[PDB]
Write a protein that binds this DNA or RNA. Structure first.
Lengths: 103, 49, 89, 67
RNA sequence: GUAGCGAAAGACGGGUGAGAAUCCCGUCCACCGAUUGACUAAGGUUUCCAGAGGAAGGCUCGUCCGCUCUGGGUUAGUCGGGUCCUAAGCUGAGGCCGACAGGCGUAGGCGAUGGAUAACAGGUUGAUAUUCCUGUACCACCUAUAAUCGUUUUAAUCGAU
RNA sequence: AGCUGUAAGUAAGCUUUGAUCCAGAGAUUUCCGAAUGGGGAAACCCAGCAUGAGUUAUGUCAUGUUAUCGAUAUGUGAAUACAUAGCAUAUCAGAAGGCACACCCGGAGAACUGAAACAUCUUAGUACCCGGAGGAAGAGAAAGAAAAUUCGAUUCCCUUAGUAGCGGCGAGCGAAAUGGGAAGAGCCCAAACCAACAAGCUUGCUUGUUGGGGUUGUAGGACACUCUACGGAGUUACAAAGGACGACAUUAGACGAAUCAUCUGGAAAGAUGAAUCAAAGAAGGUAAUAAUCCUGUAGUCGAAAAUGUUGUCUCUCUUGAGUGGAUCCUGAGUACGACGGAGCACGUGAAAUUCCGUCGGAAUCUGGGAGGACCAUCUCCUAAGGCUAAAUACUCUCUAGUGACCGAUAGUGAACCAGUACCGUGAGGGAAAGGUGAAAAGCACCCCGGAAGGGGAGUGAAAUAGAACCUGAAACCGUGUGCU
C-alpha cells in the first residue's frame, strides 16, 4: 500500500523490471501512475486553448497490484507492514526496518 | 352473535336473525331519568325504572 | 425576509428596453405579494417605487436525451421607479 | 472564527448573520449579471450562515436548561 | 413496385440554395362569402415569437414549425373569478335508525348555470395589452384639513340581534 | 491524504489546527396528508386573537394560538321557584386516531364444485368484508378432567388410526382415552372480628363507610380448643434490594498474519528452484488460477445507552402454631329446565357445551349440589361469584450473517429508464430493453462529399475487436460471381 512520493518497481506488465516514482494515485479504483511507465499515445483534437494537437505521449494508470516498494536497505521489492510508534503508525519494510517517505 | 338457520321440512336452510325483546322504558341512568331500549329479560331482575 | 424575496434580476432585450424607462424586472420568491416586493426594493436599493406589476410563469417541459422533466415555475415582478435608479449591469 | 463563533456575544452573531446575508445577495446578484467568475464563494457563505444559526440556536437550549 | 396517397385552380417571372411542381417575393387568375370571415366559452397545455443544423417527424424537401438553443415571451383598484348572495344538490354538532361497515336528518355550512359590483380614447412590440405609456375619468379605504348638528336621550349621526 | 453523491469534468477550498469518509449524539426540518382555525376540485384559498417589527397611520409582514369526550375546582343555570343538569370556563391535554391484515382472536359469510346437478350432505365455516388487540390468545390453579389401584394446578405443540363413530349409512366426514418438549406462581369478594367516622337514631342500636381477616371441605374462619415468625429468604406477581446490584454483547468495532523468485508470447498464476509460522494454515474476489496483493480467519484492546446479571444483594420476608367441619360462609333471574337454532367427528335428537324468547325457582353439616336416558355405589365443586402466570403462536421483509439454489422468460412484472412507456372516464391492466475495461487509449495528426466512405494512425498481446468494446453465432432471408 503505497503513496504519492514513492519509488517503486513494476512487477507485472509490459514495463517489467522498470522502476519509477509514483505521481498520482487514484485510490478508489486502485490505479497508481508511475513516470516512464505505460505510455499512451493520445489522439487529442484541436482545443480552444491549444494548437491542432499532438500525439500526446503521457503515462496511463497502472493497477496498484503490479507495483512493489523497494526495500531501502537492499533494493529488493518487499511487502510492507505497520509498526506502532507512540500512537503513530509507520510503514515497515518486512525484510528490514523502517522505510521513510514524505516525497 | 344471534344468527342461525331457518329450516324447512325437507331441511333446507336460510340464514336468519334472532332479535332480543327490546322495549323502550324510562330508567334512572346517572343523572336524569332517560328513555332507552332494554330487553324484557333485562328488567326482569336487573335495573330500576 | 426582505432579501430572500428578491432573487435575481432578469436581463433580456425586453427587460433592457424597459430599463430605457424606469422599469426593472426581477425574479422573486414565488410566494410573495407585490406589497412585499415594493417594500423590499425600497429597502435594498434605496429608491422610491411608483408601481409594480407581477406575473406567474408556468413550469416548462424540457428534454435531455431520454430524460424528460420540467423547469421551475417563476414569479416575475416588474417594478416602476418614481425617482432614483439602480446600477446593475 | 468557527470555534470562537461560540465566543461571540449574541449580538455580534445577529449582525454577522445579516452582513453575511447581504454578501450572499450581492454574489447571487452578480452571478446573474454575468460577472462573478469565482463561483465558489457562494457555497462557503451559505455554510457560514448555517454555522451562525446553529450556535445561536444552541445557546437558546442552554438558556433554558437552567430556567 | 401492386392498391392507395383523404373533396377544392392555378400560371409565369424573380430570388435563395449542394440541390426547388414544393420555400420566399411579385403580377395575373381563381374559391369561400349567414362563411373555409371576425370574436367569446369549454377543452388542450408552450403548439406562441426569433435565430440556426434538422440524423428521425410530415402519405416531399428544409431551402418550416409542432426536434435544439435560448432570445425568449403572458403586466389589471375598473376585464373574468375569490376576499359577496343564495337554487338544485352535497354535507351536517346534538338527534333517530342500524349485525359491523354504515343510513337518514336539525340549525348551520358548502354550492352558479342566476342576483350584486368602479374605464374609456389614442400610441406602441418579433412576441401582451380596457393590463404597458399618454390623456381624461370613476370606485373604495386610511390619515390630516376646516365652518357646521351640538340634554348626546334626542338630534340630519350612530342604529338593531 | 485526498476530495467536491449518483447525475462527469472547472473554479476550488480543505489541510497536518486533520478535509472527504465511518459509527454515535444533537440542531434545522417549507407544503399537503386523523389534518384538527374555517373552507376546498391534496400539495391551495380565506380568517381571528395576542404579541412584535414597520408605518403619521392603515394596509403589510413575522412569531405563537384557535377541531370531541375524560380529570381538577367549579360556576351560572329556559319551558317551571331553588337545585342539579346542561352551561361557559380555567387548566393536564389526559386519551382517542398510527397495522406487513403474514400469523392470532372475534362478527358476518357465498358460489362454481363432488355426488357422475343435487335440495339433505359436500365445497366450507373456505373466500375476504368488517372489528380488535398484538408481539398473542385461550386456559388455569377447577361442579378440573381420568374411570385403574386414579391422575400432572393447568396448559399448549410432533403415537393410537383412517380405528371408534357419523352418513340420501350415499359421496364423504372423522375422534378421544392410555405420553415426549416445557413445567407450575396464586389472587378475590363470603363468614364473623375490630377500630374509628358520620348519619339516622336517641346515642343504645342500626345503617353504611375506611381498613386487617380468607379463598377451598372426607374443612376455612368467629371461634372452640394450642402455643410461633424472619426459619427460609428472592423480583415474571402479590414486601421490593431502585440497590456498589458483581460479565448486556464484551455488542460499535476498528486495528492486526505468515511467500516467491527465474526463464518462452502482455504478463506465470506452464516448466525450474524454493517457501508459509501458529488459535489464522479457511474460503473467496485483483492485463496470468498469491489455502502467504484486498482481505479475512486468529489475536488485540476493547465505549454510548452497556453492566453475565449475580454468591451479602438496603428496605424487608412468611418458622404455620396442632384438634374438630358441631353452628355460620362458600357466590342469583341463578344452578335448575321447555320451546327454536348453532357448535361439538357426530345430519339437534334420547343429548353432556353456547344463543334468542319464556319459565321460574335450591340448599346448608341430617350440607346441599354437578358429571351423552333412571335410581344405589365412584370422582368432583366447594360450580354460576370473580380473577389473573411464564414456558405458548408467528416472520413484510426488520436487521445482520450464510448455502448440488434463481442463474437473469430468474427466486421478480421489474438486478437497464419499472409499477415506468403505454392503454383505460374510472376501478384497473401492464411491456420491451440488461450486460469493455488490458487500458478510451474513442480514429490528434493528416489528406477526397453533409451523411457515409478510402487511406494512413493508435493506446491496438489481436478493430470484418469503431460506440451493435457483453463479444457473438445460426437460420430465414440474401445479393453480386461463377462450374455444369
Amino acid at each position: 500500500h503505497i503513496k504519492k512520493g514513492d519509488n517503486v518497481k513494476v512487477i507485472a506488465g509490459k514495463d517489467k523490471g522498470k522502476e519509477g516514482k509514483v505521481i498520482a494515485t487514484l485510490p478508489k479504483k486502485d490505479r497508481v501512475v508511475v513516470e516512464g511507465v505505460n505510455i499512451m499515445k493520445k489522439h487529442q483534437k484541436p482545443t480552444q486553448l491549444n494548437p491542432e494537437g499532438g500525439i500526446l505521449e503521457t503515462e496511463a494508470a497502472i493497477h496498484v497490484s503490479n507495483v512493489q516498494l523497494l526495500d531501502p536497505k537492499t533494493n529488493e521489492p518487499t511487502r510492507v507492514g505497520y509498526k506502532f510508534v507512540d500512537g503513530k503508525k509507520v510503514r515497515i519494510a518486512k525484510k528490514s526496518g523502517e522505510e521513510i517517505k514524505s516525497n | 352473535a344471534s344468527t342461525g338457520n331457518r329450516r324447512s321440512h325437507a331441511l333446507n336452510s336460510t340464514k336468519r336473525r334472532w332479535n332480543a325483546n327490546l322495549q323502550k322504558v324510562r330508567i334512572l341512568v346517572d343523572g336524569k331519568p332517560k328513555k332507552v331500549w332494554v330487553s324484557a329479560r333485562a328488567l326482569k331482575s336487573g335495573k330500576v325504572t | 425576509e426582505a432579501r430572500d424575496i428578491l432573487k435575481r434580476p432578469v436581463i433580456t432585450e425586453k427587460s433592457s428596453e424597459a430599463m430605457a424607462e424606469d422599469k426593472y424586472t426581477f425574479d422573486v420568491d414565488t410566494r410573495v405579494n407585490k406589497t412585499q416586493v415594493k417594500m423590499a426594493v425600497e429597502e435594498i436599493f434605496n429608491v422610491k417605487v411608483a408601481s409594480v406589476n407581477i406575473m406567474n410563469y408556468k413550469p416548462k417541459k424540457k428534454r435531455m436525451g431520454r430524460y424528460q422533466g420540467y423547469t421551475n415555475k417563476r414569479r416575475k415582478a416588474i417594478v416602476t421607479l418614481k425617482e432614483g435608479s439602480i446600477d446593475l449591469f | 472564527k468557527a470555534k470562537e463563533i461560540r465566543d461571540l456575544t449574541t449580538s455580534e452573531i445577529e449582525e454577522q448573520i445579516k452582513s453575511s446575508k447581504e454578501e450572499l445577495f450581492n454574489l447571487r446578484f452578480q452571478l446573474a449579471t454575468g460577472q462573478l467568475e469565482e463561483t465558489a464563494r457562494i457555497r462557503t457563505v451559505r455554510k457560514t450562515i448555517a454555522r451562525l444559526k446553529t450556535v445561536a440556536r444552541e445557546r437558546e437550549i442552554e438558556q433554558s436548561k437552567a430556567n
